[PDB]
Amino acid sequence: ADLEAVLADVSYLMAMEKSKATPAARASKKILLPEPSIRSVMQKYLEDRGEVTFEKIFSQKLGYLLFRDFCLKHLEEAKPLVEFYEEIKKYEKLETEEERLVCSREIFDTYIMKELLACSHPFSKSAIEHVQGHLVKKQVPPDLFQPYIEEICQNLRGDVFQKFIESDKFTRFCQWKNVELNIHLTMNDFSVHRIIGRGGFGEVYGCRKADTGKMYAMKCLDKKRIKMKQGETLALNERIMLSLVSTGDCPFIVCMSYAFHTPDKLSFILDLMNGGDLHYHLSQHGVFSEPDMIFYAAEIILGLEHMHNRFVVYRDLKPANILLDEHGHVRISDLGLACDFSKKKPHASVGTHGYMAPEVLQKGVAYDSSADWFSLGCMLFKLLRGHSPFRQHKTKDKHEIDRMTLTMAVELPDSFSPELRSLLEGLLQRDVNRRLGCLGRGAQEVKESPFFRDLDWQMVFLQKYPPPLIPPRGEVNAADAFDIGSFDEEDTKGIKLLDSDQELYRNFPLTISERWQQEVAETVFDTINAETDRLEARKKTKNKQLGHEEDYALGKDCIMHGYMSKMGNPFLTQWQRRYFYLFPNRLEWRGEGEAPQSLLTMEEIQSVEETQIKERKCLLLKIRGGKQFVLQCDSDPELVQWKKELRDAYREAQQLVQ
């Protein structure tokens, strides 16, 4: 290969491998948390939608981390409870009874027997007796301590949670949540490496997120090409499907973290399966063997089960769409042609010739998730033979392959064991009502098939089995960027994107909370937290020494307060950032911090409405008498809450004054 390609590959590989032992060091940009005063607005914003309950926070990764570290360091009473809960959770992940026996005895002695002897145990007799009855019989199921989990959560829900909310670590949670809700991604935020694939409406590049360093796969769709091929509906459907299946914990599907668009591209951020697709590895390694294909079939069956449980039908199932991760475990990747059959069963012949179900290939006849099982059979057949059960592209014409609707699968006796012959005979049935997986419970009908009789599906979900193939660690595991190529830019000439077209993607951008929180927790949570803490320590010392504290008790009846930019003065600085206080009768206004002063009285307000200025969202207040004020906030949540609270305040004040 030429020098440029070699350099691109080396840069991509080094960025992928850099600082594996210290993920925090991979970030080139830094997350700047807002000031601790943010909680005055963010608390109301979260309360107004009921998000400050114990379950909501404790179920969030960052919320859980902050609550845990508060209990373990700033509340002695809650320390044993959180320690017990955490060790129970650790125990639940033990995979063998030989280890669970000792772990459970240690947990019992440490957190139950000691307290019982000292008579300090606060838990109910029921949980004690349940655990004692299970253990006296030598039973160590993973659900041993579930009653203790419930009771620990009940105890933490009490004054412990209120103390946490009143603490300075709920302020940190508010800061992190505000940083989350203000995610506005652009192509600048990512360091895009060499192209790794192409197809559909655009290309796929490996990329590193700037402010966390986590490696992602950026899938870009060109808006002009989408308009040219009338693909707006498909482009939006792909986002719907990705957001539908990403919300969860399934490790068998390429999950989406973010979605955004530039003026000309639609971009999805997905998991990076640096091992490459299974078709490339099949070509390099050759036909797999039955014990090897057991692994792939089991993993793909679990993935399809996850998708089907959500009523999504994966119409294009090929070896090319199956991506191997670093360690060799597979995932389903391309949800471009996926559809939902819960509302109405599709009827379009969408797929790839040689892997489409007979009812999919038939015109007009509706079909359900039943299609994915025929495609699974065809795919498993390819892994063992190098081609679909019906002729390949180089062996027959496209419509000659379509004669799959007028024949029956060969079902070779040589390369297949009788169990596999039965499995493929079931999966390649012409009649949907008789086809395996298309009757009864669905995924269970296949999972219980004889070919998987030896397989323990719990270990499949846990991914304990050794992959048959481990992708090379020193290669990109993809075709050369010259081979992948690029779309012809001339094809888009004559295509113009109207404002009515950019309106189709008004609501496109998206961020998934759990995925972002997990990324932050893995990468830069502790570093940022420490830096932030140092910054507030510095500023607190400065304020204490020089006076002008952060706030003088926040007044007597302040509804809310926070920074806002008094905007729009041509003869002064446009961004006159200041600190504001809201009261039921007036809105006060403070300078650098010496003394607050009144800016406005609610009785004067005529209306409050949002407006766009300098391509930035702002708040417009119109005043009885022709006066007006413009205020600009920093995070959409600040703007939303300020709008809501100002509106409610003046409406109530004027209605009462009526």
Partner: protein, 317 residues
């Protein structure tokens, strides 16, 4: 090789006394230096009893009969056992006058309202002999000395043909948490309960009856899943205290469920034994009980003669 045993029970129950008795019978008798050391122990025990009963008199505001002894009483308040030494002449007369004082005698008869060592009466009867400079305490005096144990203390020992190592542990609530580490390979458990604890509340808590705590601890120990293969023996100690406490106190007030006839020491003992054996969760388990009194060597001899046989039969290897 040697089997591990535990002696469990609430504080003050009498485990260390049983350890002393076992050492005396199947071990090495205490030497002259031992008794010389124990003389000081007896001295601070007497001082502690005197101070405790004076403090009880003050809190209960019981008037004194002897005005002069009041001065001594003040002196008693001034005595501190941290910088302790042998008993002195000015203190023996004051102690004798106080003990002979009917008011403090009535206060002690009302001892149920405050903590007090059960050996107080024995030492008071001893009087001059114990307080005499030529102090040569007998085995009884050494046995009847109270020294709060704390922490796990393994006491190696052996029978005539087998080796059975004992473990003495503290009985105070704060200290019980330390037992986690002594349960590793228990072969049989000996449990001690004070038969006279039905009247006195705990030391750590002034509202919970001692017997209730003992029953709760017995239930907790039996509930242990990993003791299913270890025998349990319930030594009902301090029967000589109960035979008088019942005569002076009605068991109905403490536990009304004991609707048996009053003043029947055997009836009360049987009721307590039944109440304790009932706490077991599963009847298939067997609980062996023996009325005893650690302060009497013969009772301990008789009880151990059968305890060793039961333990040996339980474990054939």
């Amino acid at each position: 090789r040697e089997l591990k045993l535990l002696l469990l029970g609430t504080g003050e129950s009498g485990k260390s006394t049983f350890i002393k008795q076992m050492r005396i019978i199947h071990g090495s008798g205490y030497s002259d230096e031992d008794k010389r050391g124990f003389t000081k122990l007896v001295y601070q025990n007497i001082f502690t009893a005197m101070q405790a009963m004076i403090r009880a008199m003050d809190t209960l505001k019981i008037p004194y009969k002897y005005e002069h002894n009041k001065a001594h009483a003040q002196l008693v308040r001034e005595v501190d056992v941290e910088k302790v030494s042998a008993f002195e002449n000015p203190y023996v007369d004051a102690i004798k006058s106080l003990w002979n004082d009917p008011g403090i005698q009535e206060c002690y008869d009302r001892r149920r309202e405050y903590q007090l060592s059960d050996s107080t009466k024995y030492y008071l009867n001893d009087l001059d002999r114990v307080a005499d400079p030529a102090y040569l305490p007998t085995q009884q005096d050494v046995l009847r000395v109270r020294v709060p144990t704390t922490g796990i203390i393994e006491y190696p020992f052996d029978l005539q043909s087998v080796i059975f190592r004992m473990v003495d542990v503290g009985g105070q609530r704060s200290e019980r948490r330390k037992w986690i580490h002594c349960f590793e390979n228990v072969t049989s458990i000996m449990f001690l309960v004070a038969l006279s604890e039905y009247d006195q509340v705990l030391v750590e808590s002034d509202n919970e009856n001692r017997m209730e705590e003992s029953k709760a601890l017995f239930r907790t120990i039996i509930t242990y899943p990993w003791f299913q293969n270890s025998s349990v023996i319930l030594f009902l100690n301090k029967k000589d205290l109960l035979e008088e406490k019942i005569m002076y106190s009605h068991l109905v007030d403490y536990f009304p469920e004991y609707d048996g006839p009053q003043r029947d020491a055997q009836a009360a003992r049987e009721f307590i034994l039944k109440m304790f054996v009932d706490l077991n969760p599963d009847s298939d388990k067997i609980i062996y009980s023996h009325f005893t009194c650690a302060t009497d060597t013969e009772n301990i001899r008789f009880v151990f003669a059968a305890v060793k046989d039961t333990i040996l039969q339980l474990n054939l290897k």
